[PDB]
From Swiss-Prot, chains A, B, C, D, E, F, G, H, I, J:
Its EC number is 1.11.1.26. Pfam families: 1-cysPrx_C, AhpC-TSA. Signal peptide: none annotated. The gene is ahpC. The lineage of its organism: Bacteria, Bacillati, Bacillota, Bacilli, Bacillales. InterPro entries: AhpC (IPR017559), AhpC/TSA (IPR000866), Peroxiredoxin (IPR050217), Peroxiredoxin_AhpC-typ (IPR024706), Peroxiredoxin_C (IPR019479), Thioredoxin-like_sf (IPR036249), Thioredoxin_domain (IPR013766). This is Alkyl hydroperoxide reductase C. The keyword Transcription regulation does not apply. Homodimer; disulfide-linked, upon oxidation. 5 homodimers assemble to form a ring-like decamer.
Length: 166, 166, 166, 166, 166, 166, 166, 166, 166, 166
């Protein structure tokens, strides 16, 4: 499992409510507690529930010094389109990376080779670029965005309190 | 060059103004004069001029027993989205295939490995599934949709008039 | 990721409060909603919280037609020993599989090659033997046993309600 | 596809109405807008229409700072012979390269391995030696020489007007 | 056979009645006459006879400047557990190494690949880290702990009396 | 050397003063004494002396039941062209094969890889399709067409008079 | 380790006080409890103690339905010689196999590649041809012939009393 | 074909009417127009006509600054023997190389693998050690020694008169 | 060593005072006691002593039902020539095989790769085609022809008197 | 053949009537005329005739500055045993090397892979460590010890009298 491994090098276009398109690299994921969530496709049939539940928790997550990135094999262009032409996804303030080359979906071992889409997986990365938590559910079973603040806290506690885990 | 070669096997989701999403295979390209045009990405910055110029010519092309397929590595979901949330692309009546697996873009050797997007290429396929014409321009140089009806006619003439090409 | 894949063939000794040691195979995960949780080592320094939290939820999980299996690369012998010589782990009523061969830990891609121990991963398997949910946290970050009943329900819902996921 | 790639190194004999035979290299395709057109064989049965159509457009193309090269796997000797012993091809003023080694036809991936002849392909190359347009038709389907001035212009426009393509 | 070969590099956790867990390397086996005994599993059904018989002989073995190490693929945690929750094994004063990685069991070619357990093998190593005696019996056939003092003596004699073996 | 070997399979277009273009195979080489002569290129600068000298001897050679084939990597089209637009080569009555695929020049190991042209080689083949004589001179050194009637005679004599060669 | 493996096929000459030279195969090892002991070389400097100690125990071992074989890479000729020209080895009544081909020494992985001699190893084989016990000591450390009757008994007990090993 | 290639390195014993045996290397071929003729075997049944015809032309060839070498896989010993015990071959004044190693016959690709003899081949080498002419006839068809002076002249003319070959 | 191996298949031309040239196969070497002697080269500087000494012993060897074959990589042609143009070798009545292909010299492992000549080796072959004696001396050390009658007798004796060799 | 090759490196134990066991290397074979004779096995059934006939010739051989070495894959221990417990072999005064590793028998290409014994081969080595004579007979055909003095003489003569071999 990628648990405990370090994020591999990548470069991709992203969109964020506010700033116009900008590049992103393995670097941005280093130096801060980043949490990236993957999802099938933009403009999909399934309701963007997962994505916005995260938006709600975003306010708080930022306080904990955490950054949030959503990823799908769609182009950053459609991410913007989706963001505008939809109230739900329009409330998202965090970063939306586009992975049309499939490279970053593939590196997190979450790309479904035959559909060309990513799986519902969420990763939590420590300031060192190391994966500390992995959650991948099948289409239908939802990811509870609330349990995130707990995990990142727990992750951060153990970060400067080794062995004190009981 | 793929000129004169036979279309390779593929299976993909498509969208068409009217019918709700449906599957498509190498078969669909066999039995009729089909002309498929590839393009970078949906919701892109470049104006969908190419796509709709083809829509104009669509009326007549259908009379000649020709079918038209647009292809991009976008999901059929976004194709629909784009089709609705845009007047220009909304006039498109022909088939819109989605190639997120990249397989069909790759088989026509028109996939840009590093960007994960297709090139501006247009192919004309005879009822046997053989490529009779190839046109690939760089971003900026436009593809003239009018010269299409001429090519397909020429292609069809030669089809049952071998050697009579002067 | 193993999400959506089918559980691989395995044969191992298990212990369960009540029945004396018995064998278990891939088939015992087929036909029923099974949820297997992996952990580092028995008699470890870290408190068996995770394991017992699941014991609490066990009552209800059984109602839902779900079976629970704990796994570590320890021998079933030590699982029993631990079970007896400890009040905490002694409350566990579900199955305790022993994976000294490391085969099953390896098949779920959760075995740490160099330490010879398993990672904190929990999987949810549908009656067909397919993995529908994966959660792997690092030492320290705890797995919330409560969010299990929700996932299994969600999993069960979509089971006989395809596409109805909004 | 070779779209966007750089012309490969080659050295060949050429003939041009006026100057007596002279050598040519990839260097002659750099610094200037060059457009090279491939054809089956000299003295072939099919009428040299395509070649001369281009002759007509030659006048103007030169104004745009564009050079024209015709290529076939024939020797430059026969190019000259053809040029003299035929009124039609005799009107040609642009360069006629001979590719008996098949190397340049092969490098543009336009050589038909088993017949040893080139396909009807036309390429447009920017002053940097990069392919910006590709058009390959089957025997019978003609290449419209007129749409060339448009393509080169469009190519030239985008050359110093990046992104301005709408 | 490993007879006459040098002990390979390894690092593992060990437990010893008295000192709390400590690391051990191939270095602890050089410099002194060490005798390591492997066994299936802790808390096993078979009576720990073998292990304790060696405990008896331990008193004298120490006099001869010999150290004793017991090894099983169990974790040092369970070694301690076993040591406490059992009168028999509780009499053991020598070192108890844990080989969950299986690396040291594998290096002495005594690991049963399919069961993930070690074979009943006892090795005698001279102060140079070279194996001078090997004894591996099947489950059931016991290893006579008494014949140890004789072998180490014999080994020690020949150590400083080459060829004098008659 | 190919001396004594059997002519390999080939299919090519040929031209002959009189008959309009026709196909030729390694089989047209079996059943009769055939003599094939290779040359650089048609319409070349070097005077077609060699080719016509053979034309002179052709009258007689036919009496001996010998057939003559000229070969160059040129297309049969240009062979015809050359034959008409030149008095010298116009006197040629024997077969003129075209080898634009280079396959037959390559099979007689007489093709100059880098120039894509054939060497000045003349071969004599017995009714069985076996090479009995090989003569390859460099550009400049001429092949004496007269010494051919003697070689074919000698060849034919030995044909039905084994060992009688003194 | 070869523990639990089956004896590999071999054919060799043997000598036994009484019967004149005779052949031996793996087959002789099957159907009876056989115990084979390897040793360096005949007429060696080291006293044949080991071999004769076994002779003493031979009387009893035969009662237990056990056969004994001594093996060295010497020829059966010298085994005979040694047996005659020496009082000590002359008391030996069991079989003396000769392994000059080194194949049987090699098969029991007891052959010292560079000296071409066997190591001091003793194996116990059940009636099925499977190795149940292995003892290999270095030159100097002696093998206790007495502990043999115990091992074979234990081996035989467990033979028809599986699991009853406590 | 070896036409235009450079003679490969070799060292062999030779005999020449007058000088007693002496060595020969590639070098002797360099700096002068050398013409080497291969033949089956010395003392063969076929009359040495070919060899002596060359002897006749030798007088003049020397005037042209040409050297002549005969080669067969025979030893230089038998070349001398043949030279003496035969009037015909005794008239030979040029060099007679012996190729029992077969290396030089093999390098000129003129060695018949199965018979171990050379083919009737004659080569003309320019002062640079490059092959300018090749003639290989089958047993029976004779090589005309007269046409040699013409070829060497032609070869020499073109040597200092490039392109002037018409 | 080839001692005891069977003569491998070969076919070669031979010469024998009396019969004109004839073929020979590994078949001739069976059914009779044959003794083949190899030597460097015919017409060599070293005196044919060895060959003729064997001729002297020929008379008697024939009585013993033995045939004699001389072999050198020379052609059977030169063997005859040498036989006639020399009193010494002219006395030879036995078979003289020629091995220009080097195959038979090579099969007896007596061919000197770099000189292309055979070594001074003599072999004795039983009627079954098996090598029973091998003698190879360096240039200078002579082979004693007299010791042959003894060897073949000894060979013949043991042939029908197994083990009676003392 | 190893004729003319140089003895390869080896190190072995030897025994000689008088001196107690001592080492020997490819060194002892240089600097003097050494003659090594191989034989099957010590204490063999065949009478040691060959070995002692050499003993008789030993006296003289030493005069010629020749040393004698007997070799068998037996251990030097058995060589001594044989030497004492047998009148015949007891007369041997030359060196008796033991080759249990089979390396020296193997280097002289005289080891019978399947029996693990050497062939009856005798080699004569010049002071440079080069093999000058090879004689290998089958079991039964004897090696004549007398012909040795002649060979070494002949060998020595040619040693300082090159070419004088007639
Ligand atoms: N960063
Ligand atoms: N030279």
């Amino acid at each position: 499992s990628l648990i405990g491994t370090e994020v591999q090098p990548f470069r991709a276009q992203a969109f964020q409510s506010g700033k116009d398109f900008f590049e992103v690299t393995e670097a941005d994921l280093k130096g801060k507690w980043s949490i990236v969530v993957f999802y099938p496709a933009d403009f999909s049939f399934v309701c963007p529930t997962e994505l916005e539940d995260v938006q709600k928790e975003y306010a708080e997550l930022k306080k904990l010094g955490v950054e949030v990135y959503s990823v799908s094999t769609d182009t950053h262009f459609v991410h913007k389109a989706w963001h505008e032409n939809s109230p739900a996804v329009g409330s998202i303030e965090y970063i939306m990376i586009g992975d049309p080359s499939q490279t970053i979906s593939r590196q997190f071992d979450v790309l479904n080779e035959e559909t060309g889409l990513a799986d519902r997986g969420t990763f939590i990365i420590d300031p060192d670029g190391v994966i500390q938590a992995i959650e991948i559910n099948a289409d239908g079973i939802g990811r509870d965005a609330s349990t995130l603040i707990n995990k990142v806290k727990a992750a951060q506690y153990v970060r400067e309190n080794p062995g004190e885990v009981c």
